[PDB]
Amino acid sequence: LPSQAMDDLMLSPDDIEQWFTEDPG
């Protein structure tokens, strides 16, 4: 499945990335 694509699509990634992987230990 095309999950990956250029960041031209997507707006500021800033949030979900932290939700993807922040460091909670």
Partner 1 sequence: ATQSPGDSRRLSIQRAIQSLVHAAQCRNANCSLPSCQKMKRVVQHTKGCKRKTNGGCPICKQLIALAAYHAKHCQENKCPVPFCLNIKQK
Least distance from partner 1 to the Cβ atom of residue 14, Å: 6
DSSP three-state, residue 20: helix
Contact indicator for 7, 13 with CB cutoff of 8 Å:
yes
Least distance from partner 1 to the Cβ atom of residue 25, Å: 10
* Radius of gyration, alpha carbons of the chain: 11
- Distance CA(23)–CA(1), nearest Å, equals 27
- The pattern of x and - marking residues 3 through 22 that bind partner 1 according to CB under 8 A reads xxxxx-xxxxxxxxx-xxxx
Least distance from partner 1 to the Cβ atom of residue 24, Å: 6
* Site for partner 1, rule CB under 8 A: 1-7, 9-17, 19-22, 24
